[PDB]
Write an enzyme that holds these catalytic residues in place. Structure first.
Site, PDB file in Angstrom:
ATOM      1  N   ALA F 127      26.898  48.925  -2.414  1.00 31.01           N
ATOM      2  CA  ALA F 127      27.681  48.279  -1.470  1.00 31.01           C
ATOM      3  C   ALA F 127      29.070  48.305  -2.253  1.00 31.01           C
ATOM      4  O   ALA F 127      29.213  47.256  -3.120  1.00 31.01           O
ATOM      5  CB  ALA F 127      27.426  46.865  -1.007  1.00 31.01           C
ATOM      6  N   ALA F 128      29.765  49.376  -2.285  1.00 32.73           N
ATOM      7  CA  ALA F 128      30.907  49.548  -2.740  1.00 32.73           C
ATOM      8  C   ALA F 128      32.327  49.576  -2.266  1.00 32.73           C
ATOM      9  O   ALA F 128      33.036  50.275  -2.511  1.00 32.73           O
ATOM     10  CB  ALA F 128      30.905  51.142  -3.677  1.00 32.73           C
ATOM     11  N   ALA F 129      32.547  48.653  -1.275  1.00 35.32           N
ATOM     12  CA  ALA F 129      33.447  48.772  -0.592  1.00 35.32           C
ATOM     13  C   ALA F 129      35.024  48.477  -0.942  1.00 35.32           C
ATOM     14  O   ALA F 129      35.839  49.214  -0.790  1.00 35.32           O
ATOM     15  CB  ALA F 129      33.260  47.714   0.776  1.00 35.32           C
ATOM     16  N   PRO F 130      34.973  47.544  -1.939  1.00 41.41           N
ATOM     17  CA  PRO F 130      36.595  47.384  -2.411  1.00 41.41           C
ATOM     18  C   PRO F 130      36.837  48.395  -3.560  1.00 41.41           C
ATOM     19  O   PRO F 130      38.000  48.675  -3.844  1.00 41.41           O
ATOM     20  CB  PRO F 130      36.517  45.837  -3.041  1.00 41.41           C
ATOM     21  CG  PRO F 130      35.448  45.357  -2.310  1.00 41.41           C
ATOM     22  CD  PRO F 130      34.410  46.276  -2.235  1.00 41.41           C
ATOM     23  N   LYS F 133      33.788  47.561  -8.567  1.00 39.13           N
ATOM     24  CA  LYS F 133      32.483  47.789  -9.232  1.00 39.13           C
ATOM     25  C   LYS F 133      32.247  49.083  -9.638  1.00 39.13           C
ATOM     26  O   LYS F 133      32.089  49.433 -10.935  1.00 39.13           O
ATOM     27  CB  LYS F 133      31.354  47.292  -8.398  1.00 39.13           C
ATOM     28  CG  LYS F 133      30.901  46.076  -8.555  1.00 39.13           C
ATOM     29  CD  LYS F 133      31.352  45.041  -7.892  1.00 39.13           C
ATOM     30  CE  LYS F 133      30.585  43.898  -7.665  1.00 39.13           C
ATOM     31  NZ  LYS F 133      31.291  42.517  -7.342  1.00 39.13           N
ATOM     32  N   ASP F 151      29.246  53.075   1.613  1.00 39.27           N
ATOM     33  CA  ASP F 151      29.518  52.034   2.353  1.00 39.27           C
ATOM     34  C   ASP F 151      28.736  52.185   3.748  1.00 39.27           C
ATOM     35  O   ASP F 151      28.418  53.235   3.969  1.00 39.27           O
ATOM     36  CB  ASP F 151      30.923  52.081   2.610  1.00 39.27           C
ATOM     37  CG  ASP F 151      31.912  50.993   1.850  1.00 39.27           C
ATOM     38  OD1 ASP F 151      31.317  50.056   1.696  1.00 39.27           O
ATOM     39  OD2 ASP F 151      32.992  51.160   1.560  1.00 39.27           O
ATOM     40  N   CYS F 252      27.131  36.883  -4.008  1.00 37.87           N
ATOM     41  CA  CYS F 252      28.062  36.075  -4.193  1.00 37.87           C
ATOM     42  C   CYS F 252      27.713  34.694  -3.356  1.00 37.87           C
ATOM     43  O   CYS F 252      28.419  34.109  -2.851  1.00 37.87           O
ATOM     44  CB  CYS F 252      29.387  36.413  -3.848  1.00 37.87           C
ATOM     45  SG  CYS F 252      29.714  37.072  -2.185  1.00 37.87           S
TER      46      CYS F 252
END
Lengths: 136, 96, 147, 177, 49, 324
Positions: F127-130, F133, F151, F252
């Site tokens: 999950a590498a959306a922004p 990371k 994504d 989170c």
RNA sequence: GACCCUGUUGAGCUUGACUCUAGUUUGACAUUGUGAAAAGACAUAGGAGGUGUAGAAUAGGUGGGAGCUUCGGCGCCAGUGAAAUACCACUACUCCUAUUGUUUUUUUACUUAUUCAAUGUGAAGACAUUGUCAGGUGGGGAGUUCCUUUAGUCCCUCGAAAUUUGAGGCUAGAGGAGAAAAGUUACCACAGGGAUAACUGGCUUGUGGCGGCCAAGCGUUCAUAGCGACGUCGCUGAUGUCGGCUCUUCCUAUCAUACCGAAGCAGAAUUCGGUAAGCGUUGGAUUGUUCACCCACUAAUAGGGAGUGAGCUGGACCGUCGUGAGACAGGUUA
């Protein structure tokens, strides 16, 4: 219009007083090696800004000024006057024991009263600036 | 690119030749300064890629991703003019 | 609603200025190169770089709106809510993209202060509202929730 | 995703030859033996490693979005246009270089062409309409463009005159956020 | 090598490096001993011959 | 009484009855009141220096000249800075547009710090959306190797693609896949990083909507997806690689059913996985037994983060090692 | 200026069939042995184990429960806690010791597997290469012309979960000639075409808009098809080619002088309104400008007009080379 004021409004600073101070610094360099700065009449966002740039950042920047100018961030700005002894003691409590290395003053009296009343009020304010400069 | 290779060549060369090369790299630091100062500082070392010693192009070795350590082996070299050469060269490294 | 707002408080450059700076990098130009949008707009974020196809359309800062007077048909109240996005201008499709506020334009408003309990017990946060006034003529935006 | 054809690679390398010098450095085998290749995905050219492109085959065509560094797109008419995502490749082997001051870098990032008063350093012997790469005074690559006049011609210029037409600046990253 | 913090005026880990590290740890030192015992193995065989 | 304190917190802070019951349960009452104060206070804004373009003090000294106040974020990271005041906007800085830094959160630094991506490996970000990371993975990897960033959405993939190009990453493959689809379609990864979608209880100031819109139904849907997401991370990674084959599970969330039960599920559905030490400097040990639901005793290596202990969003990093 | 359209271009969206397959790539296995050093999962016989919060205490858990009793310590009734302690029955795992053992893998060793070279045996080495399955992709090559949503059955599987869920199925509507290019846009650039060939003139002034309530009436017969006023309720330093000067005359939308009405208007000074144009109506400072404020003089330092007032003072056509973009002591002209 003033070419230096137009340069400030485009990119430079708030006013052309900052251009005056860098000309004095170019003429004689004292802001590069000093540590404590005290301005008895802080120009709005111009003299404190060039004081913030050339000097080490956030090192005892006193911004006392009788005119209620906008408070410049990272500069300790006071809206009280300078001639009263109570404001002098307020300055003393804020500098602790570190006296000012460089003292600055902007003489801006109510010019217009036949150039003689204005010249003396400018000169009286300049001598009052000398009294606090000789004190610290 | 040449600063790293000349340091490498000074390790395995005769005494007079090594002293001359250290004299040449001494002139590069005095003249160019900030351009090659990051080579001896390992904290300013780039992380874009890795250093290729065996490269067929000057551009492709990625010289700023390595650090110079031949001064450790050359303050110990038997000729003291080689030893004096470093202490003059590291003097202008600190003088930048 | 005002009391929760009071308790919560107790707890770049313009497009007009950008067009001036770019004009110094150019020369004798086509007459009327800039197309100032007269109609009041909502833009959202402070600084964006528009596509080239929309770069002439300058929306001045003194003609912008962020909050709207929004009335709830069932609760019979009017509250000032922030505008989230402009969804549909029923006059010009380009006005939808530019964010022009027009009578009959659907906008999305934040209904977090209103405390609307939806199905499955969730507080609503974005609702449709139709602008029911002409913000060109009066200096406010008036809307009715599509609830 | 497919590799380029003979006509497409002639057009792509013609645009790169306008801005760069060592084009054989790009098509050159490195230490591991792999090469950098060109891939086309949805009318867009990607400068990627061959080893990366080989293991990206398993991604479906509709389900693949990017690969390495994107150079630009080929338009409907067949022309190839360079994008600012190709700037690290352009800055590596830039032929002609122009440096702008701090008062000229910020107008360039807004989208203005370089003016004479903005320049802090030129490159000697530059032809009239040539491909230049724009830096600031800290050797930070900002973008690329085409010069307006020759270096000798622009030394005599009135300092509101245009010295380089802007084509791409790195404020385009603010556009897609 | 990649962790040391060499500077033109700060050389502390550079001086230390592998001070508390043995002669035999390096693969040069590991394999050269194998010929060193092979040298004495050869020296014994000609002596026996 | 506690029920009176439950109703007071639900009314004063605007929390739901279900979520405030959960949050009051996991902290002691003195620790609880500090948590609810820290939730309504915005976190400090932080900056991650791009190693591929610059280093920290040169970036720090550069932003001093533009009018930014900086201080590094502790001794735990050699890269991050903290912004206190700034005249120039951070996103319009020419150093930002050149790719010298990216605006991130301090909690986002931890999962890439817990994993150790080395040179010439093949990594997966599920999950590498922004993009904070993935660009940290490549900076540690010195633009070597392959990173598979995926994504499940086209819209947030566009912002990820721009961040890769702005920071000059060039070793990534951006794909639009569900995380469950991934072991079938590619597989065989040296490292996988999982930032599983969750309730966002650790991020309250950024997302105040989850204060009320989280019910008992939502806490059955999310840990079930995350349990399938974590089993996909195991099957993606290879047991025997030349370097380490390691897995990082990150979330989170603060709620125990979202972080500590899923790592216990993975330790009971695949015996060939083991929990290892995270390597993070600061944190609090994971809960071993919560409310009659005993976990594996190896859960103590797992670390938790809170917005009142440190100025870091509510976080959870679990690091795995694959054996067979 | 602006509006509509056409051509070229840019930016963006959509389409570009299906089946095998080259290529590329993932996992499992096989060649293929013999030794040495380890690890893990299966095999036991034992030893030791469980600190989120609160609870006196460091509560693995389940079933009985109400003294076997060296203690009546300890159980029972009392809290606090999802769960409560005396006593004996159960396996679920975690940390160690040892042997009466299976397999899989890592490091290393030797050549019989395998590969290279030669003719009428030398070298490498249990790693490659290769082979078989199960997959991923396939804008390349050869042949022919899948999922999503909707409404119903509560008719059937997998995963999770302290009894509640997520992912698919059935019925039949809607969405997605074929690598050549095609479709599309109140968007952009250039070139062109069309329409209009500046506008306003009983204009304008002091009182916001939206929504609800009330509401005399009217309406397709009328308090309801609906329209619907006054109220009331709810939400809410500018600036910068702009200024200065100009006789005479007129308007009142009156700053002053005259006269009235009202106000805790005691006197003094005033404030608000009315009739009134008879008579008067400056100068400084203020980044440079207008001011708004601030100062002095004065009875006072009012505002305007002489159909979009009126005077002095502080460019557009082709040609060439380009065009991701301009340049031309090039030509011509009002």
């Amino acid at each position: 219009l003033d070419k230096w004021y137009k340069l400030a409004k485009e990119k430079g600073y708030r006013a052309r007083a900052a251009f005056k101070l860098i000309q004095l610094n170019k003429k004689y360099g004292f802001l590069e090696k000093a540590k404590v700065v005290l301005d008895l009449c802080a120009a709005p966002g111009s003299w404190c800004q060039v004081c913030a740039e050339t000097m080490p950042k956030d090192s005892l920047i006193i911004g006392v000024d009788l005119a209620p100018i906008k408070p410049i961030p990272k500069v300790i700005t006071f809206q009280s006057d300078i001639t009263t002894e109570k404001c002098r003691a307020t300055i003393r409590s804020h500098l602790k024991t570190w006296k000012a290395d460089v003292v600055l003053h902007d003489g801006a009296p109510n010019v217009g009263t036949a150039w003689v009343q204005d010249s003396y009020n400018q000169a009286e304010l300049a001598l009052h600036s000398l009294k606090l400069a000789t004190e610290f | 690119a040449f600063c790293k290779q000349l340091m490498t060549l000074a390790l395995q060369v005769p005494e007079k030749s090594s002293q001359a090369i250290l004299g040449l790299l001494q002139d590069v630091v005095h003249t160019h300064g900030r351009k090659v100062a990051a080579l001896w500082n390992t904290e300013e070392r780039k992380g874009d890629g890795t250093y290729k010693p065996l490269s067929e192009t000057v551009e492709g070795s990625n010289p700023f991703t390595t650090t110079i350590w031949e001064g450790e082996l050359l303050r110990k070299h038997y000729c003291p003019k080689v030893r004096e050469g470093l202490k003059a060269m590291e003097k202008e490294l600190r003088s930048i | 609603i005002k009391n929760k707002r009071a308790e919560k408080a107790a707890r770049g450059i313009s497009e007009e200025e950008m067009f001036k700076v770019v004009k110094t990098g150019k020369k004798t130009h086509k007459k009327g190169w800039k197309r100032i949008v007269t109609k009041p707009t909502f833009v959202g974020p402070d600084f964006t770089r528009r596509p080239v196809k929309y770069e002439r359309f300058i929306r001045p800062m003194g003609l912008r709106y962020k909050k709207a007077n929004v009335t709830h048909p069932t609760l019979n109240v009017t509250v000032q809510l922030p505008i989230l996005s402009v969804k549909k201008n029923p006059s010009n499709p380009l006005y939808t993209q530019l964010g022009v506020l027009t009578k009959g334009t659907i906008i999305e408003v934040n209904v977090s202060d209103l405390g609307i309990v939806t199905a499955s017990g969730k507080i609503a946060w974005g609702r449709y509202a139709q602008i029911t006034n002409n913000p060109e003529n009066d200096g406010c935006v008036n809307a009715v929730l599509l609830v | 995703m497919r590799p380029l054809t003979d006509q497409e690679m002639k057009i792509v390398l013609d645009k790169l030859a306008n801005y760069m010098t060592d084009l054989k450095s790009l098509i050159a085998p490195l230490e591991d033996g792999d090469r950098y290749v060109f891939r086309m995905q949805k009318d867009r050219v990607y400068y990627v490693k061959l080893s990366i492109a080989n293991i990206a085959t398993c991604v479906a065509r509709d389900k693949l979005l990017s690969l390495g560094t994107c150079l630009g797109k080929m338009t409907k008419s067949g022309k190839f246009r360079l994008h600012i995502t190709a700037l690290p490749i352009l800055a590596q082997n830039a032929r002609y270089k122009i440096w702008v001051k701090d008062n000229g870098a910020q107008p360039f990032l807004y989208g203005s062409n370089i003016v004479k008063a903005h320049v802090g350093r030129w490159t000697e012997d530059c032809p009239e309409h040539s491909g230049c790469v724009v830096y600031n005074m800290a050797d930070i690559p900002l973008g690329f463009g085409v010069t307006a006049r020759s270096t000798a011609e622009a030394r005599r210029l009135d300092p509101t005159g245009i010295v380089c037409f802007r084509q791409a600046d790195c404020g385009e990253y603010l556009r897609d956020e | 090598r990649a962790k040391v913090d060499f500077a033109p005026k700060d050389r502390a880990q550079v001086d230390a490096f592998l001070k508390d590290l043995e002669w035999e740890k390096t693969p040069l030192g590991a394999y050269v001993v194998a010929q060193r015992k092979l040298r004495e193995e050869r020296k014994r065989l000609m002596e026996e011959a | 009484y506690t029920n009176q304190l439950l109703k007071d917190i639900c009314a004063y802070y605007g929390y739901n009855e279900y979520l405030a019951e959960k949050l009051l349960n996991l902290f002691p009452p003195r620790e609880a009141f500090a948590f609810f104060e820290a939730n309504e206070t915005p976190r400090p804004v932080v900056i991650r220096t791009n190693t591929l373009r610059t280093h920290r003090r040169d970036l720090a000294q550069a932003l001093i000249n533009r009018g930014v106040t900086l201080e590094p974020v502790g001794k735990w990271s050699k890269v991050g800075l903290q912004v206190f005041d700034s005249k120039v906007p951070l996103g319009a800085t020419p150093e930002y547009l050149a790719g010298h830094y990216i605006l991130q959160a301090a909690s986002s630094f931890l999962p890439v710090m817990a994993l150790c991506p080395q040179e010439n490996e093949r990594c997966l970000d599920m999950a590498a959306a922004p993009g904070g990371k993935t660009t940290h993975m490549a900076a540690l990897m010195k633009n070597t190797g392959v990173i598979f960033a995926n994504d499940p959405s086209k819209s947030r993939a566009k912002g990820l693609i721009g961040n890769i190009h702005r920071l000059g990453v060039r070793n990534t493959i951006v794909c639009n896949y569900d995380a469950r689809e991934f072991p079938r379609v590619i597989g065989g990864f040296d490292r996988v990083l999982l930032d599983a979608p969750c309730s966002g209880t650790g991020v309250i100031c950024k997302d105040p909507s989850v204060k009320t819109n989280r019910d008992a139904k939502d806490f059955m849907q999310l840990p079930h997806t995350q349990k399938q997401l974590l089993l996909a991370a195991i099957d993606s990674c290879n047991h025997a690689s030349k370097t380490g084959g390691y897995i990082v599970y990150s979330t989170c969330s603060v709620c125990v059913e979202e972080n500590e039960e899923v790592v216990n599920y993975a330790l009971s559905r695949r015996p060939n996985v083991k929990l290892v030490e995270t390597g993070l400097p600061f944190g609090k040990e994971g809960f071993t037994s919560y409310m009659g639901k005993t976990f594996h005793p190896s859960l103590k290596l797992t670390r938790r983060f809170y917005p009142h202990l440190y100025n870091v969003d509510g976080f959870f990093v679990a690091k795995f090692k694959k054996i067979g």
